[PDB]
A paper describes a structure:
Cyclodipeptide synthases (CDPSs) use aminoacylated tRNA (aa-tRNA) substrates to form peptide bonds between two amino acids yielding a cyclic dipeptide product (CDP). ParaCDPS from Parabacteroides sp. 20_3 (GenBank: EFK64745.1) produces cyclo(His-Phe)8 whilst ParcuCDPS from [name] (GenBank: ETB63777.1) can synthesise both cyclo(His-Glu) and cyclo(His-Pro)9.
Inspired by HisRS and histidine recognition more generally, and by the only high resolution structure of a CDPS with a ligand bound, we systematically altered three unique residues in ParcuCDPS P1, which we hypothesised to be participating in crucial interactions with the polar side chain of histidine. We first designed Generation 1 containing seven P1 mutants ([name]; Y55V; E174A; E174H; E174L; Y189F and Y189L), and these variants were cloned, expressed in E.coli, purified and used for activity assays. A similar pattern of residues interacting with the imidazole from histidine is seen in HisRS, in which two tyrosine and a glutamate residue mediate interactions with the nitrogen groups of histidine. Further investigation into the changes imposed by these mutants was performed by solving the crystal structures of a select few mutants containing changes to the active site or the pocket residues. 13 and 14). Therefore, the disruption of activity is caused exclusively by the change in these few residues which appear important for the enzyme to produce a CDP.
Numbering used by the authors: 1 to 4, 11 to 60, 70 to 230
Amino acid sequence: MELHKNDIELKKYNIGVAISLGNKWFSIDNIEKLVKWSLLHTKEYVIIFIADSIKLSDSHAEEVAIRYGRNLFIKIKERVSLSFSQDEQAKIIYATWSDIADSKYKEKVKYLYNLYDKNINFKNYIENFVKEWVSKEKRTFNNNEINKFGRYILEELPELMVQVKARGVLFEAYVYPYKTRITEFVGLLQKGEIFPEIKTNILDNHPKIFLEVRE
């Protein structure tokens, strides 16, 4: 389990652990190893959060948090309390959707929602985006569901792009085991190489760092 550079060996940043809920790779064992790696390399804290999940709430991420994210965090806490010392455990923050999506955050999501509604090229790009995943799965989806899926992506985009606080703790970098279409898209957005109005409106010269860490 290592990083696929000297700022990490110099422990410059706090490190988020981005979890894809229900993705086959994110067994409790693999999550535990990502947490182990992050604790060894972090400036101080490790922030565990749910990055995606590919009517009890107006927000999809919030509904994921309450139906499933809480039971996931509980299992992670238990495993951690058996695997790590008490001093290590104290450095872990379990950041729920609520912890992350404060007032500043939701403004950035709202800018993206408004762009999704008013810019046909953005909408079409984000929707096409969703169809690539669903064309891998065996299940099929209709348009209204593809369109809603695209909105759920936008809710989570800022926490992969902008340095946000979780319970007042800034994390400048996060770990994820593989490059995805999402991480590629984010990297283009942060450089202004795609939909440059997004960088202009909600991004801020302090880009979140993506660390590719796996076995």
